[PDB]
Amino acid sequence: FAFQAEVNRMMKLIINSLYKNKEIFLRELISNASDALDKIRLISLTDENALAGNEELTVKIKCDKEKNLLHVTDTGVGMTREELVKNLGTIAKSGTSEFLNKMTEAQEDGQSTSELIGQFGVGFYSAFLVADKVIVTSKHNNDTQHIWESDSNEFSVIADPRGNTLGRGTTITLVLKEEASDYLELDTIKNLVKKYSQFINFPIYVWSSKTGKTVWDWELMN
């Protein structure tokens, strides 16, 4: 079944080329972190134990130029295993069969090419504009911490062997594409975060340097 996948994975390397300002991926991840935070914040106004697993309400972004990773972590509501599998699984599972089905449905639905290419730039799936692989670690008050992985073709999920390390919340880890290396640059990340966090009701930080040796810590962006 290697051929069909060759067409599939290729069909994307081409569509990903239509996006000039792929930076929007960060905007979508911020937005989701914001939603998750609003959900648990809202719940806490009715349930005094809701924040027990982790009292802070923040979004924290960090770059790992060595591993070529970008981490976006929020202490929002988090997702249960079922949620990772259905809310992310079906969303990011556009393999050989899924990809084709959406196209035929799009073919008969009348869904123009525009509406199609546009789907690549909105929501969680927009992460794939700059990443070959997305790893999602999440902990929701109603379940144990789990890990979900996908390369936009398939997805897998297993209980985090490390246990509850998030307290509550979600970390989005992006294994960046060679050409998306700019998103590993501190100056690039700070500017964008500052750009897309103007309307979040929560503090957004970026792990940064501050000079007396050079030390690193969370720098508030909004």
Added chain:
Amino acid sequence: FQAEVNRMMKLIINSLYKNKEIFLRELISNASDALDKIRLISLTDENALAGNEELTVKIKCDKEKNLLHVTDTGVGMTREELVKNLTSELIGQFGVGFYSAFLVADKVIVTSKHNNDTQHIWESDSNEFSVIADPRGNTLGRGTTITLVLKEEASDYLELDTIKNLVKKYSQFINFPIYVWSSKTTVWDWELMN
């Protein structure tokens, strides 16, 4: 096989709806960008606009020869750029980029004059492409004319009102004026669209 996989994706891409009118949006876009580059340059290079003082986009229709002309007084392209700046085809299938012109044209002719070279003419039918120095010499001043030899089924674009509507439809946020060689009570002249 590269060629194999390519055609495969091609039919697939076209197996979906796409209002071919989007070709114009793409030409308007490219013109706007060309004008931006020279506009900026003119802020540092005092005589950058010497070749042609205006910064515009003028659309002309020739229902006789079945041709659509999109001329801008942007930065233009040198012979090298013509050859170089002109995955692109597939991208064209999505109605994006220079190649979107082939969604409506069997042949595309590009005339361009850049301050650093002489006027040249580039020509292509999507398969092969040719380039030669313009016999007429420098007639654009500076800028680029995209000439589309429209496909029979695309002759609808040659209609005045159709082109005007399409232009207005995609020139709302362009930082430069866009005209269409129109007529009025008969008199003929350029008519602003944005």
